[PDB]
Amino acid sequence: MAASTVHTSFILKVLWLDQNVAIAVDQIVGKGTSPLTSYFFWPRADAWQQLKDELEAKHWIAEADRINVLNQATEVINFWQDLKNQNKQISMAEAQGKFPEVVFSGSNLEHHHHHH
Template sequence: MLKFTLKILWLNSNIAIAIDQLVGCGTSPLTPYFFWPRNDAWEQLKVELESKPWISESNRTELLNSVTEIINYWQEKDKIFALSEVQNKFPNFIFVGSH
């Protein structure tokens, strides 16, 4: 079974999300980064996933649900999260950059 993860660039003014495929002990990029709220990252990732017919509907749904969850968490503007706190909340995602 193919496995995937989100790769996230966590910034103060936006968030960038890409999807990587887990390959052996590493990852391989599956999509480019899409930025939220600058663009509709969720919709762009949905289109990217639908263009890959070898990804099952259940995997697409799971990935898009994860995208929704991370975007909603980022939108909690009244809180400033330390990157370590975000990583603890989403241990299965890959975070790049610094906050």
């Protein structure tokens, strides 16, 4: 069969908390997306480190891809840290204006029980 090479791109998600923030990446599959990594809660846990660690463990990820999502993830973390010190009290929408490709979410439902 004449099979072509597809690029499984990766999308960054950010769960925004009151005094915390979590990050989680998905893989773009032929029929949509699939949860690649779970929400790592920064700064309580080493979010960025565990995120890249997952990407380094998943050896089917390319350098360009992992570095890209790590760059924007770093910007989200620096953005958050910037807010925590200045108490800017900005809105979720204002963060969306900064990160157009990043999917933000809220802790409305249970993410403590591992089903994602």
